[PDB]
Amino acid sequence: MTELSGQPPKFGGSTGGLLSKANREEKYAITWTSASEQVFEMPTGGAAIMNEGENLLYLARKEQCLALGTQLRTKFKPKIQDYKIYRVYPSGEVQYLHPADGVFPEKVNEGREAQGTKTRRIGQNPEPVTIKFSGKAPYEV
């Protein structure tokens, strides 16, 4: 969020990358360190080469960044788990996104507040007729 660093992956270009949304609306960044210069698959099509050391790459969506991240941590002989994903606005604001609290979300970490939790079963949702003409749905109450 200070200033993103890292070399761009060695890549000859493609038609599958950023469009107008990137400058008008929002784009996404993913950084990661690699112990070696090596080939990886671009989520936007084709092969690219990551540099030895730090790497910084811009993509159009959060999902493309997370797909690249899964590829990094599950498809290289020594894993790459230090990748960071940010949201970037045209104003220049950079919003750190992933991993949210410095710990991957699959494993418990202290300090997280439950969101969207219900203290009931799915079968214990109320009848819709009981909540009609309100703004809610049985899972929102």
């Binding site: 999902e63 949210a100 970490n109 202290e110 439950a114």
Partner: peptide, 11 residues
Amino acid sequence: CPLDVLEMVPW
């Protein structure tokens, strides 16, 4: 989740 919507939180 391919978009990191969810988390594991203590319970």
